[PDB]
Ligand binder design. Sequence first.
Ligand SMILES: COCOc1c(Br)cc(Br)cc1CNC(=O)c1ccccc1[N+](=O)[O-]
Ligand SMILES: COCOc1c(Br)cc(Br)cc1CNC(=O)c1ccccc1[N+](=O)[O-]
Lengths: 165, 163
Amino acid sequence: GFLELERSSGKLEWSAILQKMASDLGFSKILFGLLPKDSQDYENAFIVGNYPAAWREHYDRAGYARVDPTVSHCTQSVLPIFWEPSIYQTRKQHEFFEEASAAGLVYGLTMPLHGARGELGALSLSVEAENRAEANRFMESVLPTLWMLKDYALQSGAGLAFEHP
Amino acid sequence: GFLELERSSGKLEWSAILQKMASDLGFSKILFGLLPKDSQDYENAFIVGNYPAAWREHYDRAGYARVDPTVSHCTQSVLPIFWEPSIYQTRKQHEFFEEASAAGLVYGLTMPLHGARGELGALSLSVEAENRAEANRFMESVLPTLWMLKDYALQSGAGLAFE
Ligand SMILES: COCOc1c(Br)cc(Br)cc1CNC(=O)c1ccccc1[N+](=O)[O-]
Ligand SMILES: COCOc1c(Br)cc(Br)cc1CNC(=O)c1ccccc1[N+](=O)[O-]
């Protein structure tokens, strides 16, 4: 199923395919973000997915890239960070989690992306669940496949974002 | 289970755990290699595994880092490169295949490693098999586990190697 990502032509089809693959793994909302090597801001970012517009706008306007604990995590690790007030510490981080929750994004994980040419990014995925224990069971159940998916998305996504005409 | 690598005491236990994980998965030979960001040579390389000494020595002496097709692959991709006839394009690369085979290393794959701090490496694993069909069937059954393994190995190995 992974070959479909490479086979696709255009940001639209590629995003639709990734969203569908994520949905099949139990995740209703995803965000794929990728920056060029040594990017100093977000001007040149490639960001696609189905997170709600209002949340995307608010995150930007509130400067949450400097608050969201997953951002710094991604600069330090190749391993996923699960969304837990716990990775929250500060007042603004409590605010961030409260607002994410209100936006419907409560349980999930962020998988760091580190490309062969120094690309830096993240594949973030939200899972709908009754509670955290259930969310954790849903996520653990698909983790091996998601682990493959994130690398296929990185390899094909970097090409689509930064290379292919 | 994968966190056992990070929770190892040092280089010796980390190496033993990694080799044991690979073996339990069915790979009798593994090599983990890692370079610091923007390395010009192999002077600061962290290289661990149970590839035979004779093959390790020959690879170095022959300058096979400039021939081995997996090397350039790792600079270009995060996806695994399987050891298949198609990856050996030139006679020099074909000779590499024959020499690795003579050393007992015929079937396998190489997983590129790209760390959060610019580390560059590879995790290579060989499986003992009678033919390519048996090797493929086996590798397909363990591939998702191996895929998680390589990132856990990278994160822990990087912390061990460069701090
Ligand atoms: C990692 O780099 C930052 O990437 C972005 C960008 Br850019 C915009 C937005 Br919006 C969100 C993220 C990633 N964070 C999350 O998905 C996240 C993580 C924990 C908890 C709740 C959320 N969430 O957003 O619901
Ligand atoms: C990628 O960076 C280079 O890493 C090294 C270093 Br350093 C030393 C040695 Br020895 C081997 C490798 C990796 N290659 C392989 O395992 C390999 C790949 C295809 C076929 C046969 C082999 N093999 O060696 O049997």
